[PDB]
Every structure is written in structure tokens, then in C-alpha cells.
Design a protein around this nucleic acid. Structure first.
Lengths: 103, 754, 126
RNA sequence: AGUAGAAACAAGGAGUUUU
RNA sequence: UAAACUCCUGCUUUUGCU
């Protein structure tokens, strides 16, 4: 259910999928399944991302602080969950400062 | 001796000297007071020529509207909007049988124009009618007021950038009764001063709530504002031009998208293009009628015109057309084109301003609104206007007037032309099955017809067959202003035709001069107008270096910038001579600050400063090469090299002009009468925001070149860029990575403000 | 350029959609904005189709030319856009219809007369 | 008065003081 | 109340508030 989306999750993944669903015209959530496909998918995106930083020496480890105040930085970059502008902006920002092909 | 110039038509043929009979030199007629007397003399005239349809009464509107088509047939030569649905469909079921597969082909681009268009396509155009303030707001502020109505309503559902969900919720806006709109009213405050110990006032704007109904929103959703057609030429009277509402043009853009796409695949509508393709199409069919030119045919042309062309339409047979020209199309597509002929067939024109009354005893004037016309002591009016109210006092609903029959100006063309050419399709010989056959063209309302038949009896039997065909669909040709004669002599939107060679003399020359947009960019468009009209509107060589010679003479009067070699005086003459005696390039100095006139008819296409560049000594253009430019305010792509200069063929046309960025391309003054309105609060809130919206648009490079379409929340929108500004500067850069931590610190500090 | 003398011939004009200043590579109007979108700043392209092979060299030449201009505005970018827009405008062309003859078009053609007109530059090879 | 022509302008708009 | 002076505006002065 979409109530199960609203209850057993956090609203930071729900509302960021509220904006992400308001893209194609299914705004009162009459799908209720692609509303449920992506909220499951976006919770993977945060659990693959958070509680991992980038050190000064370059080693991979975990830190149990979790309080940046925009002073610490993450290791995996959140691209899904951004808009079609902000996705291709970050996609092209990698390919211009690196030698990577464009996807 | 007695001198008249209209006798030189005794030697010159009339279509060769027809430009003398265009008084386009004097002022055009303006309407002075209102269009209230002009709207009611059109709601009367529509419901007179359609007076026999069944008078229904709309369920959600209360409108006592008329339902006039497929009614009783007309039985006189007076015009009549009684269109036959089994002949509207029938006469364009023959549109596909001549040009095969038009309709489902032309929908397929329209099914792709619908699948890539933003809301930004409808924020450009004329001034529209918002429903929030009941006033002609221009096309940006009316759109950008109705959208946050939905945001101040419960259901937005529109913010996805495309307009189809914006065209989903305007249907859905007709469901929510409580439409809690925003009202702002002006108040005063009381502050102190510490330096002079004085206590003065201060102006500010308050806020007020307001609600609507479903018999109050739906009227305002289906409301057409009625102006007067200012500066029309060729009519002693005036007419109402209709300004469509805000919700309507969203559906109407798709309807004229399709309907223009039909006419570019057809070959008798000169309207989807400008005038030069019209001269091709005109002289095409005078030769197309010499295809079957036998040993003895007779080919009379008709210099037609249609009288009362706008009242005798009906958007109910527009719905009959766009239900048929979207055969076997998808359900959503046939639906979305169908809303616009629906909400023209329930449309409700306002009645303009009202009337200004005059005391011949107390020496007082006053004016009522147009809404009080439901309840007025009727002896306030003279004998003409009193007749006009009583015939539509049953039609006043909520200060509007229920006008379901008929269209009117400024609303929509190019689909009634599709109708009007489809009757001209029917004269193709495969469809007549008789000796007479016709073809021609169809503009907005001025048509031209060429019919042929082996004797006068056939043409007489061919002309009226056409006329009684156009009567079946509400096309009523002007028996006053039309005539017949043989081939080679007619006109068509004043494109006169003499044996083969057109004289244009239509949209003659309302401008040829300083149409001040800037100081350079009305010279760069100034010498472009003489350039373009040597091609399009056909002025010859000597009048091109007269219309240049005199263009400068009032280029130098509005902008005071005469030569130094003229010793005449204005606000500056002296320091101009500093440019004269110091620059060795005397005769290459620019003319927007007192220069020679190097232009002629070899070099109009060259811009001004790029003409005068391979002569100047380094100081002057180096003083012009400063890219700082406090006199430019580097524009946007829709406004870079665009001036809205009106022809007489359409309501507006933007045409470009090779204008180099220079210090003379400045933006003129904003009008300041909005400061004294009670509508001050639409400015003092919003004047601060394009001070700072363009502070964001520094931080995107392509935002001043392309429309930025991403997430909402402009404050959240740049900080998503700022942290991808962060890492590509962190991984590699010239700046220190400790100053990076300063760039980090600002991000949550924004979010510390909730 | 060089002028010729007046050939006094009548006007029988032909009113055709003829090209104005298309410029280099004959690239599509959206694809014209694609190579401009790279060279204004590359991180806003959104181009699902990258480029063809012929565009891969011509954008590398245009890349360094912006630094060669000046510390430059964004307006130097969308004038390079203007020389790539293939404008096709129906005009009565009594004579040749080429993007070197199309900008004059009024100097050359007329009422009793034509004006023979040979503009300078590189007469092409293809 | 005048402009004007199917309705208009002949300042609109805010403040203070005196039968 | 009737007279004068004080500030804004010249396409937004077409009309929604307290």
C-alpha cells in the first residue's frame, strides 16, 4: 500500500519520490505500484550510500558519527533521486573532469 | 484648372496605381470610450443571424445559450449561421478524398508536438485575460498567477513542466468548489525617525482571502474579454476583438497547431505563412485554371469577401470538424483537441467597461461598470443603446453574456479556414459531376474564387451552387463587397492581380521609420525594414533610398543625434566635435552619435557598427568594445534580436534584425501608472525577485540560454549544483582545499534556517 | 565584391523557400544547439546522442577559440549558434539561390532590370 | 467653447486648512 | 463646508479588497 509507503518508511524517501513521481502525469498515485516500485528502489539507493565517507589517506571504512553539519563528505554520490536536469548535470560533470565516456 | 488625382486611373490601370486609394498615411481610427456598445452590438448580431436554434440552458453554468446549427435552412440572402452537420462532415470527407490521408498524418505531428511542449509555449503571445483579477494581464503574469492558484488550491498536479498535466488540472479545477484565491489590499503603517525626531507614514500591502463557486468559477473559466479592435483600417465602425481566457488558449494552442498543419499540407490557404508564399499560391491557381482551358470555356473569377464571417461560425461545427479530422486516433488525443471547441461553445463574453454618464444640470460625469447592466433605470440610455440592452438583458449572466453561437476576432483562425477551403475543395471536377467547376483560395474572411463553365448560364449556375454550398455551413459571402469578372483581375487580402503580375499594396507602410526598441536596434531594424520590404512588400530602388534618407531624418529627431557638420544645436554639440577633430577616421564615425550616413542600397544587410568598422581608428570602437556595458543588460534568446512589429495580415509578428551588441542597445522606461493603482502589491513584492532570480541564474551557465527545467525549490536547486560544484573542484583545482571547507560550511547553514 | 552592369530584363520572380546562412557541416537545428551546449559549458548537454565523427573535430577547434576571444561572455557562444542555424525563408528569387547570393537578394533583382552582382570570397569547389 | 464620432477627452490621484 | 497650497502618475486610470 501507499499507506505502507507512508508508515513503515521515512518521509525523506517518500517526498523525494513524491516529486520523482510527479514527472509523467500519475500525480494522485493511481499507479500505487510504480509508486511502490521506486520507493523500494530509492531506499536501496540510501542504504547503498550512507555511513561511508572519504578519508584523507584514501582507505575504505565506516564512521559511527553521522553528524556532518556540511563538513564531512560521502563516498557514493546520490544521482537517482535528482531530476532529469540534475542527473545529466552530475553525469556530465564526471565525464568532463575525468577520461570517462558518457553513458 | 480643376485638379483631381483620381482621374489618373483613366490612363493607368487601377491595379497599377491602387496605392493612392490607401489612406494609410493618416492616423488609423481609434475607439475612444469602450467596446461595451460594440460587444452588445455583436451578441445581438450573433443571436439575430442564428435566431432559430433551440435555446437550451446549461447545467453547470446557468447560461441561456443558443444551439443554432442543423436548424431550419436559410430562406433568404441575409446571412445565417445555421450550419448543416451532415454537410460539414460531408464537405471535408471530401477533403481527404482530394488530398489523401491528410488528417491522421497531420495529427501525428500534432501527437508529437503535444509530446514535447512545455507550458512556456503558452506564456508567449498577446495579453490574455486572467480570471484571478478579471483584467487583461499580459501572458506571463496571467499564467504565473493561475498556477499558484492551484498551489493555493489543494491539487496542483501541474508542476511537471509539460502542459498536459496543466491541461489536466484546468479540467480538474472545475471540480473544486472552494477556489480560495488571493486578494491583496493596500494599507498604511506608522514609523519613527531618529535623526529629525519626526513621525511619518509608510505604504504597504495587506492580504485577504476570497472564495468562489461552481457557478462562479466556471463562468470566469469560460470568459472572453472583449476589447475594441483599435487601429483597424477600412471600417467606419469598429468591432469587438476577443481576448481568450487563461485556461482556454492552452487547449486552443493544440487546436490551431493541428489546423495550421492541415493548411500547410493544403495549397489554397495562404494564411500559415507570410505574404510571399501567398503571391505564389494566388498566381498558382490562375494557371491551374488554365489546365483544362479548352477551345471554348468561360472562366469568371470572383473577388469574394465573406460578410459577418465571425458571427456566422459556430464552434459546434468546429467540434464536428475536429471529431472527424481525428478519425481512429487515440482516445486521449481526440479528447484533448475536443475541449477547445467545447469551451468555445459555452463561452461567455464580458461586456467591457461600461458607459460614461453626463449631467447636463449638475455638470457631473460618472461611469458604471458593465455588470450593473442587469439592473439599471433604462431611461439613463439613449434610444439606440436602450435597444441593445433589451435584446440581451436575458443573456446577462454574472456580468457576462452567454454567446455560444459565433466566434469573434483575436480568438482563433485557421480551422474555420480549413472549413472554408473544404468547400473550395468541393469544386474540383470529380466532385461536381457537372460542367461548372470552381477553385480559389480562402484567407481569414477575404476569399477569391475562380469558377469556369462553358457559357454564362453555367457560371451563373456555378456561382450560386457555391453560394448555396457555403450557406450550408454558415459561410455567407458579402454580396456588397464582392463581384465577378474574367480571369486576371481580382484581389485577395488586398493582393491585387493585374493579368498575371501582382501589385502587393497590402500592409502598405504603417512604419518605415523609428520603431523605437533601442537606439541602435531600431536602426538595425530600421534599415532592415527598408531591406525586407524591397523583397517582401515590393518597394523599388529610389523609394528605398528615400525611405532610408528620411529614416535617418527622424532617427536623428527622436534621438537628437545630428552631425557636427550641421552647426545646429541640441542637448550636446560641443564634445561631438572632439570626436570630429581627433579621429582621423572622420567619415566612419557611428551615426547613433552624430556620424555620416554610409548606408545605401548595397549594404542594408550589414549591421551598423560592422559597416563602420574597417575604417575607425582604435580609440572609438575600443571605447565601444567595452563588454561591461551598463546600457545593454544582455537579454534572453526570445528577446535577443526580436521586436514585435505588427503587420496588417496578422495580430502580431516578431521579425529579427542583425543587431550587434553596442552601447546604444538600451532598454526603455517602464510605465509608472501601476504605482498609483491599488495593485501596487503585484510589483513591490515581485520587483525584488528578478533582482535575485538572476543571481541564481549566474550560477547556471545555460540558464540564460536555455530554459532550466529540473526540481523545484530554487534555494535547494543551486545547492545540489553547489555540492557537485564542490567535488570537481575538490578532486582538481587551483584554489586551496581549505577554502573548499568554507564552501562546505555554507550548505548546512542554509538548512539551519529550517 | 564586384558589380556588373544593368541587364534590363523584366522580373519573372520565383517564390521559393530558399536557405539563408546555414554555415558549417549542415547540422540539424537542435544538433546545432547541441554543439553550442558543449562549448558554452559541457555539464548541461543532456544529449542522448553524443555526436557523429565529423562533429568530433569541429568542436575541438571551436573549443579553444573562446579563450582566444577574451575572457568572454556567454553571448559569444550563441552567435556561433547563429551561423549554424539553417534558416529557410520563402523569398521571390529572380536569379541564383545560394547562401552567398541570398543575403543581398535586393541589390540584384528588380523591375525593368537585373543587377549582375559577383560578391567576393571563396567560390566553392563541391 | 473646442476636439471628436455611435463614446470619449475637456487631468486623474493623495494631503491639509477656514460660514 | 467653500477656497487654496502640498506629493505621485501620462499605455497599466479596463477594478478587486479592507
Amino acid at each position: 500500500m501507499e499507506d505502507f509507503v507512508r508508515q513503515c518508511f521515512n518521509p525523506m524517501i517518500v517526498e523525494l519520490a513524491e516529486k520523482a513521481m510527479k514527472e509523467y502525469g500519475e500525480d494522485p498515485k493511481i499507479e500505487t505500484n510504480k509508486f511502490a516500485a521506486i520507493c523500494t528502489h530509492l531506499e536501496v539507493c540510501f542504504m547503498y550510500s550512507d555511513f561511508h565517507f572519504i578519508d584523507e589517506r584514501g582507505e575504505s571504512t565506516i564512521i559511527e558519527s553521522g553528524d556532518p553539519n556540511a563538513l564531512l563528505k560521502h563516498r557514493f554520490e546520490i544521482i537517482e533521486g535528482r531530476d532529469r536536469t540534475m542527473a545529466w548535470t552530475v553525469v556530465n560533470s564526471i565525464c568532463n573532469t575525468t577520461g570517462v565516456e558518457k553513458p | 484648372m480643376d485638379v483631381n488625382p483620381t482621374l489618373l486611373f483613366l490612363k493607368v490601370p487601377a491595379q497599377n496605381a491602387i496605392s493612392t486609394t490607401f489612406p494609410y498615411t493618416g492616423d488609423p481610427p481609434y475607439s475612444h470610450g469602450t467596446g461595451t456598445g460594440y460587444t452588445m452590438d455583436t451578441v445581438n448580431r450573433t443571436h439575430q443571424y442564428s435566431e432559430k436554434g433551440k435555446w437550451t440552458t446549461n447545467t453547470e453554468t446557468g447560461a441561456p445559450q443558443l444551439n443554432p446549427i442543423d436548424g431550419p435552412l436559410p430562406e433568404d440572402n441575409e446571412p445565417s449561421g445555421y450550419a448543416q452537420t451532415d454537410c460539414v462532415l460531408e464537405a471535408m470527407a471530401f477533403l481527404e478524398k482530394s488530398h489523401p490521408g491528410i488528417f491522421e498524418n497531420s495529427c501525428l505531428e500534432t501527437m508529437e508536438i503535444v509530446q514535447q511542449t512545455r507550458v512556456d509555449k503558452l506564456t508567449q503571445g498577446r495579453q490574455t485575460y486572467d480570471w484571478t483579477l478579471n483584467r487583461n494581464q499580459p501572458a506571463a503574469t496571467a499564467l504565473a498567477n493561475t498556477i499558484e492558484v492551484f498551489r493555493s488550491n489543494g491539487l496542483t498536479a501541474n508542476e511537471s513542466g509539460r502542459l498536459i498535466d496543466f491541461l489536466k488540472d484546468v479540467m480538474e479545477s472545475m471540480d473544486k468548489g472552494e477556489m480560495e484565491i488571493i486578494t491583496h489590499f493596500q494599507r498604511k503603517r506608522r514609523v519613527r525617525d531618529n535623526m529629525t525626531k519626526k513621525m511619518v507614514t509608510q505604504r504597504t500591502i495587506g492580504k485577504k482571502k476570497q472564495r468562489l463557486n461552481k457557478r462562479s468559477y466556471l463562468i470566469r473559466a469560460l470568459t472572453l474579454n472583449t476589447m475594441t479592435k483599435d487601429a483597424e483600417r477600412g471600417k467606419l465602425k469598429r468591432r469587438a476583438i476577443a481576448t481568450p481566457g487563461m485556461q482556454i488558449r492552452g487547449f486552443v494552442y493544440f487546436v490551431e497547431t493541428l489546423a495550421r498543419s492541415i493548411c500547410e499540407k493544403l495549397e489554397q490557404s495562404g494564411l500559415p505563412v507570410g505574404g510571399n508564399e501567398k503571391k505564389a499560391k494566388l498566381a498558382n491557381v490562375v494557371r491551374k485554371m488554365m489546365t483544362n482551358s479548352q477551345d471554348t470555356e468561360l472562366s469568371f473569377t470572383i473577388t469574394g469577401d465573406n460578410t459577418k464571417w465571425n458571427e456566422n461560425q459556430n464552434p459546434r461545427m468546429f467540434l464536428a470538424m475536429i471529431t472527424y479530422i481525428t478519425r481512429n486516433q487515440p482516445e486521449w488525443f481526440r479528447n484533448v483537441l475536443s475541449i477547445a471547441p467545447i469551451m468555445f461553445s459555452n463561452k461567455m463574453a464580458r461586456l467591457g467597461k461600461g458607459y460614461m454618464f453626463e449631467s447636463k444640470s449638475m455638470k457631473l460625469r460618472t461611469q458604471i461598470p458593465a455588470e450593473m447592466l442587469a439592473s439599471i433605470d433604462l431611461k439613463y440610455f439613449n434610444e439606440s443603446t436602450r435597444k441593445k440592452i433589451e435584446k440581451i438583458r436575458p443573456l446577462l449572466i454574472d456580468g457576462t453574456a452567454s454567446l455560444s453561437p459565433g466566434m469573434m476576432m483575436g480568438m482563433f483562425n485557421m480551422l474555420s479556414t480549413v472549413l472554408g477551403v473544404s468547400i473550395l475543395n468541393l469544386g474540383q471536377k470529380r466532385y461536381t459531376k457537372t460542367t461548372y467547376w470552381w477553385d480559389g483560395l480562402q484567407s481569414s474572411d477575404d476569399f477569391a474564387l475562380i469558377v469556369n463553365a462553358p457559357n454564362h448560364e453555367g457560371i451563373q449556375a456555378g456561382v450560386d451552387r457555391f453560394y448555396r454550398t457555403c450557406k450550408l455551413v454558415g459561410i455567407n459571402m458579402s454580396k456588397k463587397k464582392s463581384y465577378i469578372n474574367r480571369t486576371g483581375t481580382f484581389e485577395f487580402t488586398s493582393f491585387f492581380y493585374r493579368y498575371g503580375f501582382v501589385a502587393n499594396f497590402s500592409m502598405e507602410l504603417p512604419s518605415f521609420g523609428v520603431s523605437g526598441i533601442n537606439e541602435s536596434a531600431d536602426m538595425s531594424i530600421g534599415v532592415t525594414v527598408i531591406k525586407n520590404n524591397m523583397i517582401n512588400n515590393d518597394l523599388g530602388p529610389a523609394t528605398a533610398q528615400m525611405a532610408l534618407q528620411l529614416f535617418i531624418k527622424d532617427y536623428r529627431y527622436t534621438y537628437r543625434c545630428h552631425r557636427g557638420d550641421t552647426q545646429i544645436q541640441t542637448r550636446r554639440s560641443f564634445e561631438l566635435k572632439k570626436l570630429w577633430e581627433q579621429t582621423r577616421s572622420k567619415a566612419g564615425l557611428l551615426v547613433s552619435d552624430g556620424g555620416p550616413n554610409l548606408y545605401n542600397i548595397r549594404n542594408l544587410h550589414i549591421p551598423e557598427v560592422c559597416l563602420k568598422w574597417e575604417l575607425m581608428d582604435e580609440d572609438y570602437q575600443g571605447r565601444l568594445c567595452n563588454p561591461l556595458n551598463p546600457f545593454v543588460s544582455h537579454k534572453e534568446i526570445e528577446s535577443v534580436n526580436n521586436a514585435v512589429v505588427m503587420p496588417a495580415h496578422g495580430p502580431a509578428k516578431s521579425m529579427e534584425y542583425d543587431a550587434v551588441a553596442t552601447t546604444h542597445s538600451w532598454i526603455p522606461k517602464r510605465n509608472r501608472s501601476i504605482l498609483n493603482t491599488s495593485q501596487r502589491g503585484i510589483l513591490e513584492d515581485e520587483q525584488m525577485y528578478q533582482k535575485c532570480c538572476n543571481l541564481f541564474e549566474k550560477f547556471f551557465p545555460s540558464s540564460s540560454y536555455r530554459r532550466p527545467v529540473g526540481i523545484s525549490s530554487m534555494v535547494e536547486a543551486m545547492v545540489s549544483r553547489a555540492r557537485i560544484d564542490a567535488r570537481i573542484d575538490f578532486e582538481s583545482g587551483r584554489i586551496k582545499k581549505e577554502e573548499f571547507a568554507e564552501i562546505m560550511k555554507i550548505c548546512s547553514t542554509i538548512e539551519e534556517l529550517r | 565584391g564586384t558589380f556588373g552592369p544593368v541587364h534590363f530584363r523584366n522580373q519573372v520572380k520565383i517564390r521559393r523557400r530558399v536557405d539563408i546562412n546555414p554555415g558549417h557541416a549542415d547540422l540539424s537545428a537542435k544538433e546545432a544547439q547541441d554543439v553550442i551546449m558543449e562549448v558554452v559549458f559541457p555539464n548541461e548537454v543532456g544529449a542522448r546522442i553524443l555526436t557523429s565523427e565529423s562533429q568530433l573535430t569541429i568542436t575541438k577547434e571551436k573549443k579553444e577559440e573562446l579563450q582566444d576571444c577574451k575572457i568572454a561572455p556567454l553571448m559569444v557562444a550563441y552567435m556561433l549558434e547563429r551561423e549554424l542555424v539553417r534558416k529557410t525563408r520563402f523569398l521571390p528569387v529572380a536569379g541564383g539561390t545560394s547562401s552567398v547570393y541570398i543575403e543581398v537578394l535586393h541589390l540584384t533583382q528588380g523591375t525593368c532590370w537585373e543587377q549582375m552582382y559577383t560578391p567576393g570570397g571563396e567560390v566553392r569547389n563541391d
